[PDB]
Amino acid sequence: DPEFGAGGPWEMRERLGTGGFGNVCLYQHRELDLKIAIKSCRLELSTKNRERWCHEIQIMKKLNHANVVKACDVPEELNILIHDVPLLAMEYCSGGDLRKLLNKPENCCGLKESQILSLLSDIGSGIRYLHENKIIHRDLKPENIVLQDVGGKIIHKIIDLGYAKDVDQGELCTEFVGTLQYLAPELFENKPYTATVDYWSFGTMVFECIAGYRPFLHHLQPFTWHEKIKKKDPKCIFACEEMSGEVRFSSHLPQPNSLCSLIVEPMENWLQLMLNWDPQQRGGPVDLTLKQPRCFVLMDHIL
Amino acid sequence: NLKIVHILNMTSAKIISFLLPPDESLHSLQSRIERETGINTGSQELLSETGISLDPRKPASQCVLDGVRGCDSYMVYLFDKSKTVYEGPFASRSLSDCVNYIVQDSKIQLPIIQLRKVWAEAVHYVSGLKEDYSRLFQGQRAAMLSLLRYNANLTKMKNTLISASQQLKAKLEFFHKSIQLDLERYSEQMTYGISSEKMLKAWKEMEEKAIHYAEVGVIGYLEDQIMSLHAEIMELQKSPYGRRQGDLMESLEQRAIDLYKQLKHRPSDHSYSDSTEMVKIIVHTVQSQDRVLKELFGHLSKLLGCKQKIIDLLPKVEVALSNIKEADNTVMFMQGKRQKEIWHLLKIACTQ
Amino acid sequence: LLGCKQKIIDLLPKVEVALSNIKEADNTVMFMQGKRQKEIWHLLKIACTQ
Amino acid sequence: ANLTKMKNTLISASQQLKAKLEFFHKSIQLDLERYSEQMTYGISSEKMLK
């Protein structure tokens, strides 16, 4: 209930996932055919927090990469939600979030090769774009990757940056988040983080999009899901718990998967540099030939 | 060992509390309220559950309850005098990020270990709006009593106003047949008994004086106006208060309860995953709330409006009384200028 | 209900009693104005002919 | 209603009585004072004394 009470031009259908107190809502136009969703401001945002909201919309309009969440201009219905605060209009995608495709029984044990790689060429490009604007989104969790049937194929797109950090007017946005599970161990110490924090989030998901679960201890609270893998052997990309509750580590790719007997060799190695506890060490090899690290190197070498 | 008097603002649905000391007076408190309300210290008419108005007499120790318990019960309802009608300055409580998932994500599989809270708080919010509505409703009920009392107070003077006038008309008659009663007994002796000229006009004035008077009928602008309002008030008593639909909301309450009930008593937990169902009760309660909410204020605008209408006619009552009593006194002492003036004009020959 | 009627009809005559009694004095005292005024004029020419 | 309709006129009719009694009690004795001060100067009637 964003209030409005301004006649009734447009009309919202359903709300969305994360964001905050009454975040974005599926805004469709009863008259026209546009269904672009816009974000609704929470209650009485603090005076200091006010600059945070006006900040998001700022950098959001800077992102024009149609491969991720786009920031379309706000419609005739501007005004201001709860207290003095604008809005955040953006493209809508009925393809649902990534968690949908992940929870699908058909991909109960790792999605299919097509969708898999189709996520790297997508999220991998968008995640890179954000890095080309000094915009780092660490909260890159599955429930933040919307899908769309642009034409015929599924198009993955990153979304929501109300948490991501930047460099311009508005360093960071929020310290803690909600039910963490897919984030580099950097923010877990509140210590000097890096820009590789995103590589971890992306890597972890890529793994799950092949196995069907976390790269370490699934369904295990990150609290202890950390100390158990605190050391996490080098190049390790897996660690489940044996039937006897025991713990086993491995730098290989579990079975069954969906990758061919060839894409495995590179996929494993890739995940290795993307899943390295040491921050400034994940993909350290920054070949000055492509301006990008060994992380994006293998990726492009695969796709 | 404290006071802490809860005050419900029937203009913003706020519940500001004031820990009053065993010395401060209400006139010393009214000012405090003005700092967290903005209502003029003179326009701060606080009504209690009994519907009774404020109480400039007693100090600030007129809210200490010691019968049922003495906490979160005897809450006063602050009413504004200036504001004829109440718009929407009122506000409510949020569901916090804890319940937001239940409403924003709707269908989400969250661990019961967490659901036992997000659902709990959700249920508390549901019943919250409900129980919160009752508080607001009572304000109308209290304000109603104030209006019902003002109507009686206003009418009580009407019965004495028309009764006071009946004396005027009764005296005017016993005056009009007494003032001219001398004229006839005079015109037949303007040469025999006694006859002057200075009182020829002196007396002729008294007769014309009682004429311009007559306020017994002037009560018309009042009688048919105090009743048009009197019946109007009792006629507005017919309309639906607000709690009329409050029950419909209470039904929603029981619903949420049933869900939280099937959240613990359900076959095992510590692994359950679901929340889409709760969305049901959640959304419905919201809609029902805002509907009867501003609706209650509507049926109140009329009630709150009739008061000023009674208080506006209140002064007009004294006007009638004073005017009717004015002549009631003048004509009364006019008995001397109609009798005593005969004895003063009697010894004209009592000394010849 | 049927009993209250006779109770009203029983007090009905008592009303005419009040009216008649109140109007009785209302009339007497009314014309008493002469015995209080006219009796002064009748007792006025006591020396208006000396 | 019929019974009460007369009540409103009954008390109203009485209000006239009390109103007249007052405008009579201050008129009847109003002559007594003007008389007692002239029982030997103007005229002292004895037949109207009662």
Ligand SMILES: O=S(=O)(O)O[C@@H]1[C@@H](O)[C@H](OS(=O)(=O)O)[C@@H](CO[C@H]2O[C@H](CO[C@H]3O[C@H](CO)[C@@H](O)[C@H](OS(=O)(=O)O)[C@H]3OS(=O)(=O)O)[C@@H](O)[C@H](O)[C@H]2O)O[C@@H]1O
């Ligand atoms: O849990 S189940 O596996 O049993 O069912 C899932 C659905 O709950 C879920 O729908 S939803 O909850 O996300 O809204 C879908 C997600 O969609 C996926 O499948 C559609 C194709 O759906 C086709 O088949 C369904 C079921 O028979 C029909 O209801 C659809 O018709 S309609 O409802 O759209 O009108 C039908 O769509 S179609 O006519 O275009 O073929 C894909 O388009 C999506 O890309 C998938 O994500 O997942 C489970 O089915």
Ligand SMILES: O=S(=O)(O)O[C@@H]1[C@@H](O)[C@H](OS(=O)(=O)O)[C@@H](CO[C@H]2O[C@H](CO[C@H]3O[C@H](CO)[C@@H](O)[C@H](OS(=O)(=O)O)[C@H]3OS(=O)(=O)O)[C@@H](O)[C@H](O)[C@H]2O)O[C@@H]1O
């Ligand atoms: O869960 S569902 O969406 O499947 O069904 C909803 C019901 O749970 C919910 O409660 S109930 O009907 O099961 O008891 C209803 C009603 O909730 C709405 O209540 C009012 C609006 O009143 C609606 O219902 C009344 C009768 O009780 C009708 O008279 C209203 O029609 S009208 O007067 O507006 O013309 C009807 O309004 S509606 O047609 O817009 O629904 C409001 O608080 C909200 O509209 C709801 O909370 O809603 C679903 O059926």
Ligand SMILES: NC(=O)c1cc(-c2ccccc2)cc(-c2ccc(S(N)(=O)=O)cc2)c1N
């Ligand atoms: N503009 C959008 O299309 C959009 C925006 C959001 C969103 C925007 C800002 C903050 C958080 C979420 C989420 C989803 C989504 C989130 C979850 C789902 S669902 N039904 O849970 O799979 C569907 C889409 C969006 N589609």
